[PDB]
């Protein structure tokens, strides 16, 4: 009956977890899925503000659920929805084996080869 | 009926919050008290493990509720209880205007002049 499990952070309709380790994007995604969760989807200004404040203590890169299959396609979340207009810019964006993915670091969002390893943030719906 | 409020982390019987800013120890304590909380008290190996993992993404110093009135006295938590034998060592420990206080940084615990500013961690009991 708790909104979120222990060790997660409850914010609004969702629960958030920082990953215990640093892995490539696909593996990061698999680990979120194992927890009945998904990689972070930043869907509003409120979400962006919450995430930026939460990572404000860290200089680490964190994978989110935003990617593009090849440099010719737009940025989409894992659910297929596009990046919300004017929410944030993806900095630093090329062709890699498994596409390009986005991470957030110091509040700013960057494009990177999905094969490289980073920490990640997972989210799932809160029990409300 | 939620164990902890939004933006806090629930762990065991308690809820934890990282401070929104960096202040001297007394002010940090006052801010925890305003939230119906207290500065962090690390009372067990389980607590230490939880806190070390939680701050593992950060190189910031965080004040906890451990202090000594002058360099001649032992380290006590705010509730008056002593530091648990063999839990951790207080590194780097002198006379300052308002005593000496302890902060945790990169998992290790350090002595510092209580007048200097740091982030802090607050805790309160979870509604279970």
- What residues in B contact A20, CB-CB < 8 Å? 53
Q: State this model's resolution in angstroms.
A: 1.3
B11 near A CB under 8 A: yes
Please state, as a whole number, how many other Cβ atoms lie within 10 Å of the Cβ of residue B27: 15
Solved with: X-ray
Q: Please give the Cα distance from B28 to B25 (Å, whole number).
A: 5
Mutate to test the interface with A, among B55, B57, B105, B119 (most CBs of A within 10 A): B57
Which residues does A17 contact at the CB level (< 8 Å), separation at least 6? A7, A8, A9, A35, A37, A121, A122, A123
Q: Where are the domains of chain B?
A: 1-128
Cβ(B77)–Cβ(B89) below 8 Å: no
Is B10 in Cβ contact with A2 (below 8 Å)?
yes
- Three-class SS of residue A68? strand
Please state, as a whole number, how many other Cβ atoms lie within 10 Å of the Cβ of residue A56: 14
Which residues does A49 contact at the CB level (< 8 Å), separation at least 6? none
Q: Please give the Cα distance from A101 to A77 (Å, whole number).
A: 10
User: Distance, in angstroms, between B68 CA and closest chain A CA?
Assistant: 27
Q: Which two tokens stand for residue A127?
A: 């029990």
Is B4 in Cβ contact with A10 (below 8 Å)?
yes
């Amino acid at each position: 009956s708790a909104p979120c499990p222990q060790d997660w952070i409850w914010h609004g309709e969702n629960c958030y977890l920082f990953s215990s380790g640093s892995f490539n994007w696909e593996k990061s995604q698999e680990k979120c899925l194992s927890l009945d969760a998904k990689l972070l989807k930043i869907n509003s200004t409120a979400d962006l503000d919450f995430i930026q404040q939460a990572i404000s203590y860290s200089s680490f890169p964190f994978w989110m659920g935003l990617s593009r299959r090849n440099p010719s396609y737009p940025w989409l979340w894992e659910d297929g929805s596009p990046l919300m207009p004017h929410l944030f810019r993806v900095r630093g964006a090329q062709t890699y084996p498994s596409g390009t993915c986005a991470y957030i670091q110091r509040g700013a969002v960057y494009a990177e080869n999905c094969i490289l390893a980073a920490f990640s943030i997972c989210q799932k719906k809160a029990n409300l």
